[PDB]
Design a binder for this molecule. Structure first.
Ligand SMILES: O=C(O)c1cc(=O)[nH]c(=O)n1[C@@H]1O[C@H](COP(=O)(O)O)[C@@H](O)[C@H]1O
Ligand SMILES: O=C(O)c1cc(=O)[nH]c(=O)n1[C@@H]1O[C@H](COP(=O)(O)O)[C@@H](O)[C@H]1O
Lengths: 256, 256
């Protein structure tokens, strides 16, 4: 098993994956903050304070009450300062012709500021083809949703295998997965795992939690995605540090 | 087989489905316009001119360059005038806790103006539970995506059966399907079918077309969803009338 720093140099590595893996090893962080807030000021204050602790900040631009492209300009300044990627968790899931416009255009202009986006594989590979026609020229990357954290997920068995095949056949643009576990045996591909908290439990709407030690150490994923376990805590910086240290040690111990 | 007007009276009919079925029979239209445009002025000019020909106008609010909630106020005026429903084709596809905020909040406030939205079933039933916590109080309806039109779609076999079960278990909120065919045997549920053109063909990004006669007449669906077959034509009103007459006659001939 290669370190993040060695994976950053693999021959077939995507440039966005390489940038991410380098800053993960430099900063000793494999934590992605899920910045699930409705206020731009809270998003930016979290990005600035937690920036040093995270490899990535995941957005849902469509729940921000006061979105403007200028908010995203300020987020990019913080991402460059503290060295983290911006991942818009848009879960594109339409025909190729539609998703290319949803990615490039409208009010959000996602491709103009998001290093990474993700897509569901259920529509077939046209979803990736449509996104890549915007994303390749803008030097972006994409994650495919191979497994989900929620109760009753149908992203299992042949579905997960189809996501891995689709990623591996679009390696010019697809840099990894949303998954609960290592699903690809190819080390060029990132595994990001949501549904993470230190304590056992879930929410009232089908979310299920596993610990950083379980998903990084036992299930072999690379990065934990954490929302409420950080966001709902009083001290979000100390919560982020708890999650960072948990995910980083689980990674080191798997490396041996 | 019951007429649209008789289905509007079924004991278990959802109020949004009833309103739709009534105006379909009154206006002799089972056409949904896919208003896939980037300009508010073009969206509103199409809604006004084609309003009399359609039972429904389907939006992708996130490809509109000049979206404002005031554009949607003007669209509601036209929907009330000409009698059609507004369907935002957002394809919610996240955990329940996330989709409730994407539906109610952010810049778009989708639930404030959309009669109908749709969701993918791949995350499990929490996606429906989250949406219904916003949509039930706002007297809205939802469609579940049981089949897709695009090449390589994984929405087949057990996946399609899971979508039908999920709809039937959330009939307080779910009023039907995006599908290529009749998938539910319960007449209270609407079937809306995209991937429709009069001529054989497809697009360069995995879209596949079937005719109104095939999907309404042979496959037993209720409503055709048509984008480029209308939008790219010079005379969009005559194109809409061609599609309306095709879908309506296919429906009548299946009724016998
Ligand atoms: O794509 C995601 O990040 C995602 C996929 C998935 O399977 N489960 C999942 O929870 N997520 C997202 O990750 C975050 C989880 O947040 P918490 O449950 O608060 O930690 C939310 O923003 C979800 O939208
Ligand atoms: O939900 C939809 O309407 C949808 C589902 C599907 O399986 N296929 C499909 O094409 N659509 C949408 O319906 C429209 C099809 O447009 P045309 O191919 O131009 O007629 C697009 O806006 C798609 O986003």
């Amino acid at each position: 098993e290669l370190s993040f720093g060695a994976r950053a140099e693999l021959p077939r590595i995507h440039p966005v994956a390489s940038k991410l893996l380098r800053l993960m090893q430099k900063k000793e962080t494999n934590l992605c903050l899920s910045a699930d807030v409705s206020l731009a000021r809270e998003l930016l204050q979290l990005a600035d304070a937690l920036g040093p602790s995270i490899c990535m900040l995941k957005t849902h631009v469509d729940i921000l009450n006061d979105f403007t492209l200028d908010v995203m300009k300020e987020l990019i300044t913080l991402a460059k300062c503290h060295e983290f990627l911006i991942f818009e968790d848009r879960k594109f899931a339409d025909i190729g012709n539609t998703v290319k416009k949803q990615y490039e255009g409208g009010i959000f202009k996602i491709a103009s500021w998001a290093d990474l986006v993700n897509a569901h594989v259920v529509p077939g590979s046209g979803v990736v083809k449509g996104l890549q026609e915007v994303g390749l020229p803008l030097h972006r990357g994409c994650l495919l949703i191979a497994e989900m954290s929620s109760t009753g997920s149908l992203a299992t068995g042949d579905y997960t295998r189809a996501a891995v095949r689709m990623a591996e056949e679009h390696s010019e643009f697809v840099v990894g997965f949303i998954s609960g576990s290592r699903v690809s045996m190819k080390p060029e591909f990132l595994h990001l795992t949501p549904g993470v908290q230190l304590e056992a439990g879930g929410d009232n709407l089908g979310q299920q939690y596993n610990s950083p030690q379980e998903v990084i150490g036992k299930r072999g994923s690379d990065i934990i995605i954490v929302g409420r376990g950080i966001i709902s805590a009083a001290d979000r910086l100390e919560a982020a540090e708890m999650y960072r240290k948990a995910a980083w040690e689980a990674y080191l111990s798997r490396l041996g």
